[PDB]
Amino acid sequence: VNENVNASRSRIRDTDYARETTAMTKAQILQQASTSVLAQAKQSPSAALSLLG
Amino acid sequence: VNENVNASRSRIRDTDYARETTAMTKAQILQQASTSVLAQAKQSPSAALSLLG
């Protein structure tokens, strides 16, 4: 019973490194994707003053 | 009566070296199987190290 409950708690409490590592990597690529567009986003007012100002 | 009682007692209590030695050797092989599989089982979390690393 001790083994069986140990494996049962693993399936609901322990983390899956196969999925969690992929989940973090999807977020890290998500970071640099959002930071890069953010870098290109604040140049919208840069087009404003370069227009005539 | 003493001779036949002694023979009966041996059949009930006295050990059988032919059977006991086989059980001892089989148990010895069983433990050596268990230590080998346990050694390979301890490295299972190490397979989880490669994903994030």
Curated annotation (Swiss-Prot), chains A, B:
Localization per Swiss-Prot or TrEMBL: Secreted; Bacterial flagellum
Disulfide bonds: none
Stretches that traverse the bilayer: none
Signal peptide from the UniProt entry: none
Record-stated family: Belongs to the bacterial flagellin family.
Reported function: Flagellin is the subunit protein which polymerizes to form the filaments of bacterial flagella. FlaB is not essential for flagellar synthesis and motility.
Quaternary organization: Heteromer of multiple flagellin subunits including FlaA, FlaB, FlaC, FlaD and FlaE.
Additional facts recorded: V.cholerae is able to differentially regulate the flagellins within the flagellum maybe to produce flagella which are particularly suited for motility within a given environment.
Protein name (database record): Flagellin B
Chain's gene name: flaB
Portion of the full sequence shown: 324 to 376 of 376
